[PDB]
Enzyme design. Sequence first.
Site, PDB file in Angstrom:
ATOM      1  N   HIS B  53      39.499  62.770  25.324  1.00  0.00           N
ATOM      2  CA  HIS B  53      38.910  61.626  26.021  1.00  0.00           C
ATOM      3  C   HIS B  53      37.492  61.913  26.507  1.00  0.00           C
ATOM      4  O   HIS B  53      37.293  62.799  27.350  1.00  0.00           O
ATOM      5  CB  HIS B  53      39.779  61.236  27.217  1.00  0.00           C
ATOM      6  CG  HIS B  53      41.235  61.128  26.898  1.00  0.00           C
ATOM      7  ND1 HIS B  53      41.748  60.110  26.125  1.00  0.00           N
ATOM      8  CD2 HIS B  53      42.288  61.905  27.246  1.00  0.00           C
ATOM      9  CE1 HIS B  53      43.053  60.265  26.002  1.00  0.00           C
ATOM     10  NE2 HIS B  53      43.409  61.347  26.671  1.00  0.00           N
ATOM     11  N   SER B  76      36.547  61.494  20.943  1.00  0.00           N
ATOM     12  CA  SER B  76      37.609  61.167  21.880  1.00  0.00           C
ATOM     13  C   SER B  76      38.956  61.152  21.169  1.00  0.00           C
ATOM     14  O   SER B  76      39.053  60.804  19.993  1.00  0.00           O
ATOM     15  CB  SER B  76      37.359  59.809  22.543  1.00  0.00           C
ATOM     16  OG  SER B  76      38.450  59.451  23.388  1.00  0.00           O
ATOM     17  N   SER B  81      39.585  55.460  25.743  1.00  0.00           N
ATOM     18  CA  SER B  81      39.417  56.335  26.898  1.00  0.00           C
ATOM     19  C   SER B  81      37.969  56.718  27.188  1.00  0.00           C
ATOM     20  O   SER B  81      37.693  57.172  28.302  1.00  0.00           O
ATOM     21  CB  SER B  81      40.261  57.604  26.723  1.00  0.00           C
ATOM     22  OG  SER B  81      40.042  58.208  25.460  1.00  0.00           O
ATOM     23  N   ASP B 131      43.466  67.339  22.311  1.00  0.00           N
ATOM     24  CA  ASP B 131      44.297  66.618  23.286  1.00  0.00           C
ATOM     25  C   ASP B 131      45.191  65.648  22.509  1.00  0.00           C
ATOM     26  O   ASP B 131      44.770  64.547  22.136  1.00  0.00           O
ATOM     27  CB  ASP B 131      43.439  65.891  24.326  1.00  0.00           C
ATOM     28  CG  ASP B 131      44.265  65.278  25.455  1.00  0.00           C
ATOM     29  OD1 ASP B 131      45.457  64.969  25.231  1.00  0.00           O
ATOM     30  OD2 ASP B 131      43.726  65.109  26.578  1.00  0.00           O
ATOM     31  N   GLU B 156      45.735  70.417  24.966  1.00  0.00           N
ATOM     32  CA  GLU B 156      45.708  69.952  26.360  1.00  0.00           C
ATOM     33  C   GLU B 156      47.054  69.397  26.853  1.00  0.00           C
ATOM     34  O   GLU B 156      47.412  69.598  28.020  1.00  0.00           O
ATOM     35  CB  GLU B 156      44.630  68.870  26.523  1.00  0.00           C
ATOM     36  CG  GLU B 156      44.649  68.214  27.878  1.00  0.00           C
ATOM     37  CD  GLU B 156      43.808  68.984  28.879  1.00  0.00           C
ATOM     38  OE1 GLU B 156      43.211  70.012  28.489  1.00  0.00           O
ATOM     39  OE2 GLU B 156      43.727  68.575  30.060  1.00  0.00           O
ATOM     40  N   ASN B 181      48.772  72.820  28.459  1.00  0.00           N
ATOM     41  CA  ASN B 181      49.533  71.888  29.289  1.00  0.00           C
ATOM     42  C   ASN B 181      50.376  72.606  30.331  1.00  0.00           C
ATOM     43  O   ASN B 181      50.509  72.132  31.469  1.00  0.00           O
ATOM     44  CB  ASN B 181      50.449  71.017  28.427  1.00  0.00           C
ATOM     45  CG  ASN B 181      51.130  69.919  29.238  1.00  0.00           C
ATOM     46  OD1 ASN B 181      50.508  68.899  29.563  1.00  0.00           O
ATOM     47  ND2 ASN B 181      52.404  70.124  29.580  1.00  0.00           N
ATOM     48  N   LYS B 186      47.918  72.869  35.583  1.00  0.00           N
ATOM     49  CA  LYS B 186      47.738  71.733  34.682  1.00  0.00           C
ATOM     50  C   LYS B 186      48.958  70.823  34.762  1.00  0.00           C
ATOM     51  O   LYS B 186      48.881  69.750  35.378  1.00  0.00           O
ATOM     52  CB  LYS B 186      47.475  72.241  33.260  1.00  0.00           C
ATOM     53  CG  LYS B 186      46.803  71.243  32.332  1.00  0.00           C
ATOM     54  CD  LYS B 186      47.779  70.170  31.838  1.00  0.00           C
ATOM     55  CE  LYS B 186      47.024  68.974  31.225  1.00  0.00           C
ATOM     56  NZ  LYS B 186      47.961  67.980  30.646  1.00  0.00           N
ATOM     57  N   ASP B 190      47.475  68.000  36.896  1.00  0.00           N
ATOM     58  CA  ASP B 190      47.054  66.922  36.000  1.00  0.00           C
ATOM     59  C   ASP B 190      48.186  65.913  35.740  1.00  0.00           C
ATOM     60  O   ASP B 190      48.039  64.720  36.018  1.00  0.00           O
ATOM     61  CB  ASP B 190      46.547  67.581  34.704  1.00  0.00           C
ATOM     62  CG  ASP B 190      46.056  66.624  33.658  1.00  0.00           C
ATOM     63  OD1 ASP B 190      46.765  65.680  33.274  1.00  0.00           O
ATOM     64  OD2 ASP B 190      44.980  66.894  33.098  1.00  0.00           O
ATOM     65  N   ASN B 191      49.323  66.365  35.191  1.00  0.00           N
ATOM     66  CA  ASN B 191      50.292  65.402  34.659  1.00  0.00           C
ATOM     67  C   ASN B 191      50.909  64.556  35.778  1.00  0.00           C
ATOM     68  O   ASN B 191      51.110  63.347  35.610  1.00  0.00           O
ATOM     69  CB  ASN B 191      51.411  66.106  33.848  1.00  0.00           C
ATOM     70  CG  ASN B 191      50.885  66.904  32.589  1.00  0.00           C
ATOM     71  OD1 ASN B 191      49.749  67.383  32.569  1.00  0.00           O
ATOM     72  ND2 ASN B 191      51.745  67.042  31.559  1.00  0.00           N
ATOM     73  N   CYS B 195      48.377  61.124  37.400  1.00  0.00           N
ATOM     74  CA  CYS B 195      48.893  59.780  37.207  1.00  0.00           C
ATOM     75  C   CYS B 195      49.153  59.103  38.547  1.00  0.00           C
ATOM     76  O   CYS B 195      48.980  57.889  38.660  1.00  0.00           O
ATOM     77  CB  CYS B 195      50.156  59.807  36.336  1.00  0.00           C
ATOM     78  SG  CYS B 195      49.832  60.503  34.679  1.00  0.00           S
ATOM     79  N   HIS B 315      51.033  59.520  25.919  1.00  0.00           N
ATOM     80  CA  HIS B 315      49.900  59.721  25.013  1.00  0.00           C
ATOM     81  C   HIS B 315      49.772  58.625  23.961  1.00  0.00           C
ATOM     82  O   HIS B 315      48.653  58.242  23.606  1.00  0.00           O
ATOM     83  CB  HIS B 315      49.985  61.069  24.298  1.00  0.00           C
ATOM     84  CG  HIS B 315      48.724  61.428  23.566  1.00  0.00           C
ATOM     85  ND1 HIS B 315      47.578  61.845  24.214  1.00  0.00           N
ATOM     86  CD2 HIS B 315      48.425  61.427  22.240  1.00  0.00           C
ATOM     87  CE1 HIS B 315      46.630  62.084  23.321  1.00  0.00           C
ATOM     88  NE2 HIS B 315      47.121  61.847  22.115  1.00  0.00           N
ATOM     89  N   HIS B 374      42.066  60.581  35.193  1.00  0.00           N
ATOM     90  CA  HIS B 374      42.221  61.423  36.367  1.00  0.00           C
ATOM     91  C   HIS B 374      40.886  61.679  37.063  1.00  0.00           C
ATOM     92  O   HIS B 374      39.831  61.678  36.422  1.00  0.00           O
ATOM     93  CB  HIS B 374      42.863  62.754  35.988  1.00  0.00           C
ATOM     94  CG  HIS B 374      44.241  62.616  35.430  1.00  0.00           C
ATOM     95  ND1 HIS B 374      44.884  61.397  35.338  1.00  0.00           N
ATOM     96  CD2 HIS B 374      45.111  63.546  34.955  1.00  0.00           C
ATOM     97  CE1 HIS B 374      46.097  61.589  34.839  1.00  0.00           C
ATOM     98  NE2 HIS B 374      46.253  62.879  34.578  1.00  0.00           N
ATOM     99  N   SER B 382      42.790  71.625  34.910  1.00  0.00           N
ATOM    100  CA  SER B 382      43.059  71.531  33.482  1.00  0.00           C
ATOM    101  C   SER B 382      41.946  72.162  32.664  1.00  0.00           C
ATOM    102  O   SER B 382      42.192  72.968  31.766  1.00  0.00           O
ATOM    103  CB  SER B 382      43.224  70.059  33.090  1.00  0.00           C
ATOM    104  OG  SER B 382      44.202  69.464  33.905  1.00  0.00           O
ATOM    105  N   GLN B 386      41.333  75.309  30.090  1.00  0.00           N
ATOM    106  CA  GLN B 386      40.837  75.170  28.721  1.00  0.00           C
ATOM    107  C   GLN B 386      39.792  76.241  28.395  1.00  0.00           C
ATOM    108  O   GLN B 386      39.843  76.865  27.325  1.00  0.00           O
ATOM    109  CB  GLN B 386      40.265  73.773  28.492  1.00  0.00           C
ATOM    110  CG  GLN B 386      41.307  72.711  28.155  1.00  0.00           C
ATOM    111  CD  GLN B 386      41.882  72.844  26.719  1.00  0.00           C
ATOM    112  OE1 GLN B 386      41.502  73.737  25.944  1.00  0.00           O
ATOM    113  NE2 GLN B 386      42.812  71.951  26.377  1.00  0.00           N
TER     114      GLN B 386
END
Lengths: 462, 461, 461, 462
Positions: B53, B76, B81, B131, B156, B181, B186, B190-191, B195, B315, B374, B382, B386
């Site tokens: 993204h 992307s 995104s 990703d 990712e 991930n 992460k 992140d997840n 959200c 996703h 995010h 995250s 990486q």
Amino acid sequence: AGFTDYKVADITLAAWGRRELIIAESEMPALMGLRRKYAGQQPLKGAKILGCIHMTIQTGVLIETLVALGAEVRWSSCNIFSTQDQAAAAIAAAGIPVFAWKGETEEEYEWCIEQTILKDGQPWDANMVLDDGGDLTEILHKKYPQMLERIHGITEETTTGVHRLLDMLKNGTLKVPAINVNDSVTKSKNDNKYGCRHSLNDAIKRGTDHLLSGKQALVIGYGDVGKGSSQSLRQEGMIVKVAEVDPICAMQACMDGFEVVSPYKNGINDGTEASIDAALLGKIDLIVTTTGNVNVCDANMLKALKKRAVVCNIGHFDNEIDTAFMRKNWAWEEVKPQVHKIHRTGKDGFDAHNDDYLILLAEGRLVNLGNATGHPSRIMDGSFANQVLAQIHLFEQKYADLPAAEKAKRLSVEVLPKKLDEEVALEMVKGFGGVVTQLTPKQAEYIGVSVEGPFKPDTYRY
Amino acid sequence: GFTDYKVADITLAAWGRRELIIAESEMPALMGLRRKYAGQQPLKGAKILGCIHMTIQTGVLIETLVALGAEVRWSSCNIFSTQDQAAAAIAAAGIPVFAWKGETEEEYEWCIEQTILKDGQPWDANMVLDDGGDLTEILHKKYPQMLERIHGITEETTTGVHRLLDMLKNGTLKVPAINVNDSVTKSKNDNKYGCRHSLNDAIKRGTDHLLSGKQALVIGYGDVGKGSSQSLRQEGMIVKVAEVDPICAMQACMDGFEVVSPYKNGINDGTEASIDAALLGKIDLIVTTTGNVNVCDANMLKALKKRAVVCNIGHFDNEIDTAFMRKNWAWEEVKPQVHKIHRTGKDGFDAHNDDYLILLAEGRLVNLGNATGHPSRIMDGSFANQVLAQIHLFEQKYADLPAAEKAKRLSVEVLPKKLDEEVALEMVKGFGGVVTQLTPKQAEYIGVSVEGPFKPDTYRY
Amino acid sequence: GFTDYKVADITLAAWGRRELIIAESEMPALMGLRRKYAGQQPLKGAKILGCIHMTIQTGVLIETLVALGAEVRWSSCNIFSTQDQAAAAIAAAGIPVFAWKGETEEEYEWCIEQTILKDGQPWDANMVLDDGGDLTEILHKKYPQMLERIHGITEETTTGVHRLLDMLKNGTLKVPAINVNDSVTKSKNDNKYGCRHSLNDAIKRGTDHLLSGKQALVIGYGDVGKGSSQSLRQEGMIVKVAEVDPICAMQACMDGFEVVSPYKNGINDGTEASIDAALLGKIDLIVTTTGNVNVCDANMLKALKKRAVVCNIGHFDNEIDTAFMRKNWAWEEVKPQVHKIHRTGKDGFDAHNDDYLILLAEGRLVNLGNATGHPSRIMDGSFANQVLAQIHLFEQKYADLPAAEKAKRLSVEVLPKKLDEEVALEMVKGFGGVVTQLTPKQAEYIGVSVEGPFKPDTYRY
Amino acid sequence: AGFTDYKVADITLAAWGRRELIIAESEMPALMGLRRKYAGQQPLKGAKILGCIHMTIQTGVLIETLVALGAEVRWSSCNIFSTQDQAAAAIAAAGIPVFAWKGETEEEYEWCIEQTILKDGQPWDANMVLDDGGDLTEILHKKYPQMLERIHGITEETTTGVHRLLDMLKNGTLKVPAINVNDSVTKSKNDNKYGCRHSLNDAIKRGTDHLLSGKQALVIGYGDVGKGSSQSLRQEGMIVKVAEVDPICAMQACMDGFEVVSPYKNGINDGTEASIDAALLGKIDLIVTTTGNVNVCDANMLKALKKRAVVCNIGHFDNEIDTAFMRKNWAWEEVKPQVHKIHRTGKDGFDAHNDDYLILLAEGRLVNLGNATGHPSRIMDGSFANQVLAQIHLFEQKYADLPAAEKAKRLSVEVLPKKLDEEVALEMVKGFGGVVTQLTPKQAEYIGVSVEGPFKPDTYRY
Ligand SMILES: NC(=O)c1ccc[n+]([C@@H]2O[C@H](COP(=O)([O-])OP(=O)(O)OC[C@H]3O[C@@H](n4cnc5c(N)ncnc54)[C@H](O)[C@@H]3O)[C@@H](O)[C@H]2O)c1
Ligand SMILES: NC(=O)c1ccc[n+]([C@@H]2O[C@H](COP(=O)([O-])OP(=O)(O)OC[C@H]3O[C@@H](n4cnc5c(N)ncnc54)[C@H](O)[C@@H]3O)[C@@H](O)[C@H]2O)c1
Ligand SMILES: NC(=O)c1ccc[n+]([C@@H]2O[C@H](COP(=O)([O-])OP(=O)(O)OC[C@H]3O[C@@H](n4cnc5c(N)ncnc54)[C@H](O)[C@@H]3O)[C@@H](O)[C@H]2O)c1
Ligand SMILES: NC(=O)c1ccc[n+]([C@@H]2O[C@H](COP(=O)([O-])OP(=O)(O)OC[C@H]3O[C@@H](n4cnc5c(N)ncnc54)[C@H](O)[C@@H]3O)[C@@H](O)[C@H]2O)c1
Ligand SMILES: Nc1ncnc2[nH]cnc12
Ligand SMILES: Nc1ncnc2[nH]cnc12
Ligand SMILES: [K+]
Ligand SMILES: [K+]
Ligand SMILES: [K+]
Ligand SMILES: [K+]
């Protein structure tokens, strides 16, 4: 008929105890399902279980499940203040040896454990061990090693006990295989978190009847217990601060909306009064330890606390708090059992109207069991279903009957397989009326699982 | 005279730079790595194909890789995104990027093609950052020769990891990969928390609906489902949760949610008969979070309460049977990425019809599609993972090992816990948090080094 | 030798005094009133009939009224609300108190009469402090002559304020009253936050049931219904809310609750066919908060999910049709104030029967019945208002006025905002809160004095 | 086409505006219920309403309910940043005079109000006034007092506007009667609180896309807007501190689980840099003003805020924050429309990478409307059904036609009766699908109310 092989506080509490057990049974559907699926098979026919865990009403349903599946047991509590006397009484009244009462002395505690190990003044032919904290495990390895020769395994309830088991394993001093019951998800992310969520504020209310909303709390630790303790206090409206040594757990606390602070300036604990962040501690109305570590609420911290703060520990042992310092230097005033004001004015007596005191709950012992009734039945359903499965498994594997060479390959600390973890959860969910969706064949194919599970790789953290 | 890019509008570059400068202050772990390793240039020689993204946050990830010596060519991983001002800002710094918000599928495939091909031939890429696995997929299916030069893939997201593992199982994965991930900084950052912040954000921007007092159904309760349920519950929604995993369902109950199935007794038999029409007729909002296929199917869509909002935050769009909606119902565009799907029929619709659904981002990831995904300070963790993952596999030089050593390292691995902790420390410091140092006696007591790591590898947090 | 009292156990005094000394540190508004006024003895000559839950908090109130010069004769306003160690401490201090936990109805009325009668004659009382209107009712009906000497009533709770206004409306109220309930530092403190704290407290102590993930039905969303719903929701219960007031229902919706009725279309026609059997069959816990009559009726009780918990936190037990259950169903005492009601019939029960409900405190005030009521730091608000109201009305000497002047003074009023704000300031300082002082320019801007009051009398907070 | 009596940003936005109006109609059942119940009777036939209120999609539905009941209107926004250009466009495309666009200047703002008051250069024969904040009321009384001779009433939307009416009433300067719409429960305790809960964090995300969880917020005021603002931030996981001058609201914030603090040491704001709590403000990532008062985020507070703090105001007027001080001393860097970096390093230019800046949203104007879209349709439904009922009442009372003796009796500021308040709430509840229970006669008699209501005495605070 003339049964005398027990020691409880008041046998006449048995009927009260039976009334609460019959209720707990309706709150524990995984356990009762285990009773129904396995009673006719008697998978514990022959098991002789030494049990050392809080003699609560919930433990009593665990005990009668083991007995219902064929085992004989001898039982003690793993804390001096955690027994419910009506649960003890009811288990005795059923003819099951038990040695447990709320408010034991340290000497009485050790005596009670020995009454499970010794029958008619000699070692009982035990062959299984169920433990919560490692104390029974410890006395078997250190004092009665010859008994472990006849024992097939240990199913160990809690984080601290597991730690001690793995230490023995790495040192070559563990003598029998153990199952880590704690690390089932239906235990650690059920019991350890949500359980303390339920029972920590419960215990504080019962001990102090203190308003919590709008007051300041400091929770030491943000593991599973710290997570749920923090929640127990925040959902009541406390301003909650969290301490941690683990930066990952500290990251979670931040993201969960807590301020992360240390009792020591710049987090450095050099043993001086000067390292204490006195401004922070002078604001704290309530401190709770959740670490399983030693001395995380130390003497200087105690000196620095706001007048009249509440002090309590919900980790497994009382050495999280330097209570010995407090006995050495400060006068103790009992409000009522398991609630003590500790007057920081000195050792020899106190002024009944002094304002410079602390309130200590349960003398630093596990506060949710010491001042309330610990986790509720429906949470303990999951933990205690894991226990029953672990017992059946280790008893079936008959480790004690192997040659020395097979024992050696077989000595291990293992967890329950995910499939059993999942099946325990399904029954808990059904208990709430929840309805789990079933994958279609194409969906199970698509994410590479079987329609019946497991649904996650063993690496999954939930 | 730099022309090696395609974006919506280059004049947005100055705006993007201003937003990039703000993000860097929101990303201490990432910037700390940029400052720590710039001197060594540990990615000097690296030629990274990147597919993720093209947001402001991705921009800070990109310039970090470049500051450590890498060349990159970027696209992307989703048609909706991109943040066009992030895209513009990157292009303006001379970094090849092919991305705009609002692409077609055909444009999406071309954008990836542009990162792979340079001057009409395959670029001499040696690293992949992905990703979702789309770039991993095109390389293995259409340019397998290029994988002979590639030292690894840093993937990712959950779906991407799952795809890597299936290739590994089948013997079709050609280079090693790091599962970014599943770092705790992460997956459990992140997840979930991402959200939580960005789901309700996107619903508000698309519809400006009030959420409080209304009924939500969240399909799934993994990390994205846990976070998504919280996004709605904290706004005052009455949230119900659907799950096939009983352990995750148990968490939802304990977290204070009612657990329900869209099908009677939880059994889908493909007929309208198995739909819980009464349950679905009360649902104001449905959110798919599963990474599975067809978890909001056609019969569910037929049964939803009039004017319910439909969106997906997993996703891929196939979580919702939009194909069925395209075949049978008339689409009215409200504004970009907001559609009324009129269930009165296919040919045309009444402007004042009341029997429609609202679909956000044509079923694509809604937080990225209808907002900005995010926040920088979450992506910080995250994207630091990486960088560390890129540095690791680049230094391993898998593509230069003899066959027997290749066989030893052909795997999907996660970052060591020590590193995960170090990212988390920088994040905590970003909040002004103060971590306590263990004393020597305390570290001996729980059997860890004062410096960590602090938990066994089995720990779930 | 002091004998003018009756308690469960006088040897509990020392324990009660320990808890009183703790509760003084939790009640800064109240203890502040001792300090500002104990030198002036404003209640010198006061002879107060007091009838309110004999708790540790009531004990601190009681001792504050005495410290300011008053004599008192005290009973409780509920058969289960007394804490016996408090009653014992008050007795042992030489104060007439008649109260124990678990009185019968006969004993309850006896206890009130021992406050009214001293040495078998009417006490020369001149003040009333009441919670619920029971003491007031017995004076007006059975001892009307004693009101000729009484200057006024200070009434604690919503239900009693309603009864007072019924009399003022009918011309049957003999002396004026302060409505203490409607101070904001009472209604929006005690009624709401007190129940938040104490409802889940009492359910835990009664049953030890997990609340997370279970279904609750709260009848009512006034101040008590607001606090109670929060008490359960913060534990993770899925809470549904019933209301007859559309405004209170709108707040419940906005607060994140589904608003439902026990009856189809909300129409209670008295038949089993009017019950929403599907809803009631899913409810794990029901709580009455209305101050109304029979809002958890016989048909709702017949329809409740097996093993549902049933309780009331409104002032009076007629909220629940317990008389139906006493007539038709067999009761099994689990422990004091906890009863399984076996819906299999009246003629005994099976110990392992599964078709029972659990009733707490026999339908009386559950927070005081199964725990200890509100915490000291909340009752502080209420009881500072009580003390102030006692001074107000006593200094007014209504009983010495001629009838024509009595007529003009005969009313039910609330304390002025300024006193309300003064109590609140002391509560705030008890938390360590720091109120900001307006500038003269700022005070002029919004049209207030720097010293308050800060809001018009119409303001709802 | 032919009709040119308007000024909006971009008329081609009309079709998109219409689409959002149609959605909004389904989110506003009280407003649309009013529309259906009264379109036939045309109770507003002959009414001529000068309307001044944020030209949003919600206001568009309100405008079209009034028109549907017989009224002509002439409309402007009450804030320079609050208009939704697609709503303005949809309204002018419907043939309705509207003078409103996002990003007006001050000179343009007053021009727009003037264009509602004048039609073809002469004053419009208006006879009703709908206002939000009192600006329209203020120009009529000051500069066009003759027009008030024909005007039957003002219906005022917001707390600041009501405060201004009461002060004119006390002064004898209010020339027509007014209805205080703000103080309906379905307005004050719905719009003012839950509206800001929805729209504050919305606006901050759109402006900065900042993570809010784990960060430190300071909310100035805990009235209805303050209560909603604090909840908006806390539910996101912010650590929220509250300041207040009213001890009763401060007591509510405590019980609500907030720490109550002052920017000034001991609360004492004496204008000195030394009175500022530099420690406190150096920890604050976000300050929100909610007071309706003046200079409650002052120069010295601005100097002391943590680097890169976000600053915004959700009160009606921008003078809650001393932005004039910032314009005078610091350099403004526009990030994007309504998002400014304010560089505390000086006035003449800045370092593009300066770290020592603040972020100011909406230039200090109402941030929820400036940076997002204000309240959601289903909340504004309550406020705007109240407005319509208020307009019907005052237009039917025909104050401007009454004899002087009757004018003097009716010159007041009134609220709607509780019965209409309840009827508004009923439609709202129904819009959520809530079911309200009907009292039986016995129950109605026992609490002394009618079965139809009202259900509470007028003193009731909810
Ligand atoms: N009372 C109960 O009902 C109950 C239930 C389950 C577990 N427990 C006990 O609670 C304890 C903790 O269990 P857990 O499952 O949460 O374990 P855990 O490993 O998940 O968490 C403990 C945490 O404490 C932190 N910590 C350690 N030393 C610290 C220090 N000096 N300062 C701050 N934080 C520090 C660690 O980083 C770790 O995150 C154990 O003793 C366990 O047996 C009690
Ligand atoms: N939008 C974002 O910003 C974002 C961020 C991270 C991940 N994701 C994506 O979101 C998806 C989920 O990610 P995750 O990390 O939560 O994965 P996960 O494995 O933790 O959670 C998925 C969950 O869905 C459940 N599930 C599967 N099929 C289901 C069905 N038919 N009905 C109900 N529940 C079902 C599974 O049991 C599992 O708990 C993936 O596609 C992932 O890549 C999106
Ligand atoms: N237990 C405690 O500590 C405590 C504290 C304060 C007050 N109370 C008592 O609790 C009761 C409520 O007090 P309050 O201050 O909240 O009063 P309230 O007037 O604020 O609220 C009662 C609510 O019940 C609703 N209601 C009435 N009949 C109903 C019915 N049949 N179905 C559904 N809803 C119905 C009304 O609409 C009203 O909103 C009174 O008896 C009061 O004296 C108890
Ligand atoms: N943006 C929106 O959508 C919106 C909605 C409604 C109202 N408003 C406006 O917001 C403002 C507040 O409205 P409200 O309805 O909450 O009014 P309110 O009277 O209920 O609350 C304002 C509060 O500010 C407090 N206060 C005053 N000076 C203070 C100071 N120096 N420090 C701390 N606290 C201080 C007061 O004590 C009061 O409690 C008004 O201008 C109103 O018109 C905005
Ligand atoms: N109620 C309980 N019974 C047994 N062990 C426990 N551990 C925590 N709570 C417990
Ligand atoms: N959306 C909106 N429309 C009109 N006035 C408002 N005031 C606050 N939000 C509003
Ligand atoms: K228990
Ligand atoms: K973003
Ligand atoms: K109490
Ligand atoms: K809006």
